[PDB]
Amino acid sequence: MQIFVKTLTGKTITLEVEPSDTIENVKAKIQDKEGIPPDQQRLIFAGKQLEDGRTLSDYNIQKESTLHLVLRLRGGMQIFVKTLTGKTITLEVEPSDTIENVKAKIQDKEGIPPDQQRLIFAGKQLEDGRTLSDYNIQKESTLHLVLR
Amino acid sequence: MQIFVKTLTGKTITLEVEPSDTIENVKAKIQDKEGIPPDQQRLIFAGKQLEDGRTLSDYNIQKESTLHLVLRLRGGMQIFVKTLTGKTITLEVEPSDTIENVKAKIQDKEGIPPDQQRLIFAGKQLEDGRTLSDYNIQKESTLHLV
């Protein structure tokens, strides 16, 4: 009950768990430390993919047992952001994602700091505190960035 | 000089080439005998992705050698086909594809027999002896199926 996972880069991370948790429970924990969205991560062992739900006991996983992680390209849910220039960029997000969570990811692509950013969704201004759910932003939706 | 190209999951074709022949040259030859469009095939020797501009000498590809083939998932140009009321499908095409070849590509996707197919492109019905380039059809273009 102290296992690691490894990306195909070599980058290893130790994950404090017990031989009871489910596959998604592990995935849940990964996002805790690393911040990697659960649905964007697949997990492998003994040469085979693991399915959410079935507990890690079943798949013969032991202590210091080396697990294999793979990051997908998609993420299940996506939204769009239009820049002051007219550019459209696709963000990978989840319902429970604050405006700071969104502002974060926008900084990665476009670059621009999270303080030049003021997001206008259907007329009204967005605010760092409230998540995507509060404003009720379904996938495929398109945000707008304008001058602060 | 001859080399064997093989994709990851089975199927080894053997082909005859010269050392001065470029990569884009060998790809033309792999299409010539396998159909796979050059923009859809990537070659690999010694774990490197070959380049269309350099030759087999530039990479030390001697006789009895093996190049690995990887198929793309798209091709640079694709058109769409709407059954006029039904679902729309994506086709992987080349500007010099004939219309019959477009029917075959449709039949692979929706079973529709090329005989039972009538295609219109922004008005005008597409004949079979002609090509997409002949009707100035380009990427993103959408064809109508009747």
Added chain:
Amino acid sequence: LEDLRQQLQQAEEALVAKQELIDKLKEEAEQHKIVMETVPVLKAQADIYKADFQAERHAREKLVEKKEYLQEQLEQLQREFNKLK
């Protein structure tokens, strides 16, 4: 017999050699085994990239239709406006 002793040790030595070979081999096999582990996961990755592609192709298709309809919906409202005042 001068020669008997000779053979026995000539064999004993050739024997040690082999044992050192297997030790060397067993040591590479160990290296080979943690590396091999990386193959199934390079496949499981090629796969979820393909599915990621398809789920992306799709959304594109759904996007192709939604713009087709909009184009017509717009053309309509235009015919209807022109026949108006």
Added chain:
Amino acid sequence: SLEDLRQQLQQAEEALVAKQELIDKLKEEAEQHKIVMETVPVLKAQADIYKADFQAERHAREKLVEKKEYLQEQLEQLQREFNKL
């Protein structure tokens, strides 16, 4: 005794063969491994290509989302001026 010396020569030639087998084995298994490994470059390249194509599809989709938006607000515009007259 010379008697024992012979019983050791034989004893040791049977070790040589038994060991030589454990070599042939490890030799074959090592080869098989080398065959499976010489493919990882390809797995790499493939994972790579797929991701590439994916990216392509994500931009294609990106353009459409940008078109859909445009026609969307152009329908809105028309409607606003049809509601008059």
